[PDB]
């Protein structure tokens, strides 16, 4: 009822510190329901294609890039992997959303050209490519009650659905089930945060909780009973069964 | 005019060299910490992305972070880790002089 | 027609980490020629004896491999510089 | 944040002080006098709370 | 040549010793809300 004052604009959780500096709404994030997947590699996240077209990463072009950044610019904003925006040398932001295939082809032809303007002779164009498989992502599940509940996952871009796909080993860390829980996904935009999430916050490093040093990752239920069955004295397998099990679980091409 | 700035610059440099801990008596950990490794990789990746020269041969690679990990493997990253001390003093360790893991 | 020494705080691009002297020249000193500078007094015809400070003060000046402070958020490096500038005083 | 837009200066520290009434008028762009936020015609008045001095309001160039 | 004008044309001389830092915008809004309390914040720029 009372008209708020300046002090009431800063005082409590609804104020300004605890609501716009201690924590802020952020760009290049996504939220969705998690659904299980035992065919991802326990360090990866199954990214739906609906996110894979929106989330982008600024990639400056080079001589080692114009092989595939050019192809992404030719692919365009919808076909994945592709690019949405191109940032020019003098800061001009060009969008690929409305352009035609001829325009995209011409732009990607001019994606690496020498600069006649010497002011920005130290900069190269940046292409806002789609989130490919080599990228890294930062998962999160509120209430984030410990540092393990915010880890780094590599991205595996799945073709079908609109739920983020998670392996079963990432459940004791998030305290998560798969009965409608939703997890936040944050996509870092600079190489420093990339290397942070790959090395410091990555999920491989979070095997033991600092709380007591006990491990926090492992298979859960179906895999446990399957193991008790597979490793009993009654289990015998012919040559074909043995070789098929081993290859199916190993796959030396990856 | 310029005498005032020269005085300021001299005092700042004096404090700087008072804070630089000489190589003879730097007593921090010989190994490179995980945070140092992560940041060295990230900054080297940034430099390669912004067209800094690369001292290794790519296997036809295109991920700048992978290139940085390659250079760190071959010990070709020209960076220095200024390990600041709580008092403000610091030691300059080079990545070459630091052993990973 | 006088010569003015200058203390400079310039940004060195990552692309020039093999000839930092040329890099500082091309980024800042070349765009400072024949232009009225609000500090030195007026225009600049040229320069000579460019010298770059060092981020590690222990390294004596009898060296060529100087450290450059690197911006935390950016590959660009910042450091102090010294250079004699030839102006045309109004 | 763009990584091709380096920043030179940093905030090395901050201090708390009082904004004296002399410096406020020194740093001011306009004094507010009359509580005429928007008159008829749906526009701000000159010298009012939503003056063109305190910024560019709607499709109006800032008067400062 | 150290003078400059305003949009109202009331020109005056002032210090050009101004810089460019990287800050959140909520910092600027907080500084406004602090001016509304008669409280000034002095941010010291590391290179002077």
């Amino acid at each position: 009822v009372p008209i708020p004052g300046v002090k009431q604009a800063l005082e409590k959780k609804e104020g300004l510190f605890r609501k716009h500096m201690m924590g802020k709404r952020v760009n290049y994030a996504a939220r969705s329901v998690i659904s299980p997947d035992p065919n991802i590699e326990t360090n990866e996240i199954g990214v739906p294609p609906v996110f894979a077209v929106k989330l982008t990463y600024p990639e400056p072009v080079t001589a080692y890039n114009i092989a595939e950044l050019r192809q992404a610019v030719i692919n365009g904003p919808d076909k994945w992997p592709g690019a949405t925006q191109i940032q020019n040398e003098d800061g001009s932001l060009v969008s690929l959303i409305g352009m035609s295939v001829e325009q995209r082809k011409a732009l990607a032809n001019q994606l690496l050209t020498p600069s006649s303007n010497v002011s920005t002779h130290t900069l190269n164009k940046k292409v806002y490519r789609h989130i490919k498989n080599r990228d890294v992502v930062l998962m999160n599940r509120q209430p984030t009650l410990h540092k393990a509940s915010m880890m780094g996952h590599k991205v595996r871009v799945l073709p079908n659905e609109k739920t983020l796909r998670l392996h079963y080993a990432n459940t004791g860390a998030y305290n998560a089930d798969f009965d409608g829980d939703e997890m936040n996904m944050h996509f870092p935009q600079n190489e420093n945060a990339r290397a942070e999430a790959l090395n410091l916050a990555n999920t491989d490093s979070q095997y033991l909780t600092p709380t007591s040093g006990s491990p926090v990752r492992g298979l859960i239920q179906d895999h446990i009973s399957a193991g008790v069955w597979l490793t009993s004295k009654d289990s015998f397998f012919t040559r074909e069964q043995y070789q098929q099990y081993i290859y199916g679980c190993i796959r030396p091409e990856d | 005019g310029p005498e005032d700035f020269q005085q300021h610059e001299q005092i700042r440099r004096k404090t700087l060299k008072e804070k630089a801990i000489p190589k003879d008596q730097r007593a921090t950990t010989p190994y490179m910490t995980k945070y140092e490794r992560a940041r060295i990789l990230g900054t080297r990746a940034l430099q390669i992305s912004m067209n800094a020269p690369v001292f290794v041969d790519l296997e036809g690679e295109t991920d700048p972070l992978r290139i940085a990990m390659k250079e760190l493997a071959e010990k070709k990253i020209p960076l220095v880790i200024r390990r600041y001390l709580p008092d403000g003093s610091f030691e300059d360790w080079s990545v070459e002089e630091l052993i990973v893991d | 027609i006088v010569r003015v020494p200058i203390a400079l705080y310039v940004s060195l691009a990552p692309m020039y980490l093999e000839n930092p002297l040329q890099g500082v020249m091309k980024q800042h000193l070349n765009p400072l020629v024949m232009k009225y500078n609000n500090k030195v007094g007026g225009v600049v015809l040229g320069y000579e004896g460019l010298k770059i400070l060092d981020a590690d003060p222990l390294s004596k000046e009898d060296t060529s491999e100087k450290l450059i402070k690197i911006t935390p958020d950016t590959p660009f490096g910042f450091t102090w510089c010294h250079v004699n500038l030839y102006v045309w005083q109004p | 944040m763009d990584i091709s837009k380096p920043v030179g200066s940093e905030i090395t520290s901050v201090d708390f002080g009082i904004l004296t009434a002399k410096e406020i008028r020194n740093l001011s762009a306009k004094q507010i006098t009359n509580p005429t936020v928007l008159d008829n015609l749906g526009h701000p008045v000159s010298g009012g709370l939503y003056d063109l001095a305190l910024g560019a309001f709607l499709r109006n160039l800032c008067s400062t | 040549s150290q003078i400059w004008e305003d949009g109202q044309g009331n020109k005056f001389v002032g210090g050009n010793e101004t810089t460019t830092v990287a800050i959140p915008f909520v910092l600027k809004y907080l500084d406004s809300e602090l001016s509304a309390m008669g409280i000034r914040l002095r941010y010291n720029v590391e290179p002077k």
């Binding site: - | 005019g1 310029p2 700035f5 | 400079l8 705080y9 102006v87 | 030179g8 | 290179p47």
Partner: peptide
């Protein structure tokens, strides 16, 4: 234009006109 990649952050004179 006139950004950190063309103009220096700060210019200081160390000596009066030589």
């Amino acid at each position: 234009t006139a950004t950190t990649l063309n103009t220096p952050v700060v210019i200081h004179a160390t000596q009066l006109p030589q």
